[PDB]
Design a protein around this ligand. Sequence first.
Ligand code: GSB
Ligand code: GSB
Lengths: 221, 221
Amino acid sequence: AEKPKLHYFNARGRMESTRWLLAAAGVEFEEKFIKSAEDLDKLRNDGYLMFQQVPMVEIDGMKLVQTRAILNYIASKYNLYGKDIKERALIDMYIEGIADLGEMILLLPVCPPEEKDAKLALIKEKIKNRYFPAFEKVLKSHGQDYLVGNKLSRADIHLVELLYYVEELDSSLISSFPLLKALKTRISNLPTVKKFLQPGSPRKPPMDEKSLEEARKIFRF
Amino acid sequence: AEKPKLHYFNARGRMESTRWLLAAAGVEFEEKFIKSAEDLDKLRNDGYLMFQQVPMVEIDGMKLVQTRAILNYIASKYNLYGKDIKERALIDMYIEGIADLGEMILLLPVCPPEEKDAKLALIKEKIKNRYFPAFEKVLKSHGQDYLVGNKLSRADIHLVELLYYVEELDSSLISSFPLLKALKTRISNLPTVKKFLQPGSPRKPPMDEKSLEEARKIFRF
Ligand SMILES: N[C@@H](CCC(=O)N[C@@H](CSCc1ccccc1)C(=O)NCC(=O)O)C(=O)O
Ligand SMILES: N[C@@H](CCC(=O)N[C@@H](CSCc1ccccc1)C(=O)NCC(=O)O)C(=O)O
């Protein structure tokens, strides 16, 4: 209990951006998986989850419960949040555009089957016209290697993680965006991220039929 | 252009928590309203909106675009974000539970009319069982006047703003939560917030038939 213990089920879900921030920061974590609905209710009843939900992360003696509260703490603790407030204002504006798009991709497996391909067509229109041009534009304006202060931050890890999810959606979207392609390569070869991308890591896979089935059972949605 | 200029339409919407944070911090702002869809496209074409959307806030020479990026900057600039990172980790966990609930109430006027009362019944179940007990519990644990460091922060203004929206939904929900009732009274009598609650302020009203009509026209949803 010096190693962060991330409480969640065995899936990408809402824990994955934390798994990537901690691993890129070189921190080693421990995971306690929720296998059943009763695993989640025990957690609730013991007073571990402030709003009855997970992600939950035991770190520095706190039972931290919200995604954005978990990430903001880790990003500050490990110097991945910029040097001053004008610098983390640019990081929050970029990474919140990334969480808007990321929420669309995250929830797409739960979409009503009629809607599913209309939603997917809308997510590809947003990537082409709105989100990727915006980020191509900040990398093109300063011509530096990193999104914000010519120093690695959480905006780069949160953006590259998303570029991996968009590549699984359709590997053709990124092709007209050369500076994003370059940033993906670059952050993917950093030793901490490279370790994480390798075959034995705590990194999780796409949601399939059986994970979504387990997710509906545990979280009763 | 020393006064922040908040760009949005003339409604509560996603700008209202900024209107409350700035006003409680004693800052005076200016508002440029979007009246039409073309008012929004001019803004887009001039390169003011990074992801083609509003809220947008011109502050300290930045055209800041995301809600959480706007609020995090103002809250840091005006000392409303806690003293250290363990203190803003508690503020982010509390205020993100408040934004979950607040998103439900915000979007309720746009819900499909079949669904509307089932959604409203669900929001009242969440308030009674999940969100208000959680906050009653932190005020009861330390017995202090403020949610986080016995000093006013953004967690108190964001929570009281919500207690006003829940009171318009159903004035009976808060009654079994005495310490929240007390915090509402207390923050409402601070001179900056009191000024804002008074009849001539930049504070906005509930969404009605005609505001939602104007909102669908400007934002094409
Ligand atoms: N805003 C919260 C959201 C948390 C949340 O919704 N958690 C879900 C689990 S994450 C849900 C999920 C499942 C499948 C795919 C994506 C997300 C949960 O615990 N549900 C039980 C409850 O509400 O009582 C956060 O970011 O931490
Ligand atoms: N995550 C963004 C969300 C921004 C957003 O959705 N903005 C809307 C305006 S806010 C929408 C709204 C309307 C009525 C009631 C609640 C919210 C917008 O500009 N839409 C145009 C577009 O997407 O191209 C934020 O927090 O800033």
